[PDB]
């Protein structure tokens, strides 16, 4: 096919504009995923109580700090209890001499009158709106898990739709669906509907993710394909900083979710403008339109060959592939052929390690550091140079030497969080971010690597399987964090255990 791109211009204006346009959409799409750190942030909270919150209460010289000890028992974390209150005011507890036995456990009651939340950092969050705390606390990681399962099912549905209707035609409606479903999620009346809308949003997120990359590859000459895919990957790195900026600017979740969703109505329009994938139209029985798309791109690049491209030349120049790639085949065919079976096994373990380790740690930054906005931004700041170095190593050594080394180093950095002492907070945050950056370098490496390992028709299906495995690990992520009832030691050890072994296994994969 590349002989035709050589007539159309393999790296001209059109590829520049296409890369820019898709990079922007990928940035906003990344904000859509990372938003959970800010839309669903858990403000500190306590039970409503008369002496603290009754506006009709008789005034006294007692400070709020004293009334709080009079009204809320001490929690096991040595802070005011977040799920209990005193049945009757403990005036006796005002003195410092009071024993722990002064108030009986039977004097405590749950938040009968509801919770009160800290408004200082965020004006509103879903946790504050639907009381996803105490007995309901599990619902937040359930929301994240449902979002990731939505991505998984969307990856399952994208491939067939992409091949049946075209790359750009699926991408366009994925943009529209993201816009509409995010706008609706911003206004959901109750938690079940919010989860429903987030799920239907992730369903389209998956299609955008896959189609943008596939359509970048299918229009770019091979000599610069890795560079373009690296830029498409850096879209997410910049999306991290964009998320930090918007979350700093918009402290209300109902407004933040709307703001990060509206841009996709604009992305819709430019998705309409773009051309459908020429190779797809050529192989899928529509050269008559592939010629029109080709000469559209030629006009944009300014080539004279618009006078040369003709249907007979088009049919002649792709004879080999048109004569052989006539068969659609099921997903399980990736596992039926002996060679593709092993390629898929190793690539799937690599994708699983990426998705597991990254999405386990990237969505709970409130535990990793004292400033969630800055810590969110630092993920992009560290991911940029990691992915550029990944590109350089992938070019000057190869795909195989880069993948294994990146995963091993990221695994080591992840594990180090369990060996540095708890009190050295800054170093722990630094190492966590470094591990995330190494996993990002492995993400870029494998994205390029596994797109080469599979044939023309099934490339999209192979990448979809990669997405599904990575999001299986991602779904296990929040549940691995629900395992945190035994303390943070277990989740971090779990996250660190996988990537090192996945890297050691990666070395068996053939170079491409
Ligand atoms: O390197 C990545 N960083 C991300 O923040 C992100 N988000 C996502 O869905 N895929 C990726 N990949």
Numbering used by the authors: 3 to 514
Quote the study's own text:
Among the several renal transporters involved in urate flux, urate transporter 1 (URAT1) is the primary one responsible for urate reabsorption. URAT1, or SLC22A12, belongs to the organic anion transporter (OAT) subgroup of the solute carrier family 22 (SLC22).6,13 It functions as an antiporter, moving intracellular organic anions or chloride ions to drive the uptake of extracellular urate from the renal tubule lumen into the cells. URAT1 is also an established therapeutic target for the treatment of hyperuricemia and gout. URAT1 adopts a canonical major facilitator superfamily fold, with twelve transmembrane helices (TMs).
In the presence of urate, we captured URAT1 in multiple conformations that represent major states in the transport cycle: outward-facing (cavity open to the extracellular side), occluded (cavity inaccessible to either side), and inward-facing. In all three conformations, urate binds to a similar location in the central cavity and this binding mode is notably different from previous predictions by molecular docking on homology models of URAT1.34,35 In our structures, the urate binding site is surrounded by several bulky aromatic residues, with five phenylalanines (Phe241, Phe360, Phe364, Phe365, and Phe449) forming a hydrophobic cage that encapsulates urate with hydrophobic and π–π stacking interactions. Urate binding to the outward-facing conformation induces the closure of the extracellular gate in TM1 and TM7, leading to occlusion of the central cavity by Met36, Asn39, Leu369 and Leu371. We observed that as the transporter transitions from the outward-facing to the occluded conformations, the side chain of Arg477 swings away from the pocket, weakening its interaction with urate (left to middle). The transitions from outward-facing to occluded to inward-facing conformations also include the opening of the intracellular gate. The intracellular gate begins to loosen in the occluded state and fully opens in the inward-facing state, permitting urate release into the cell.
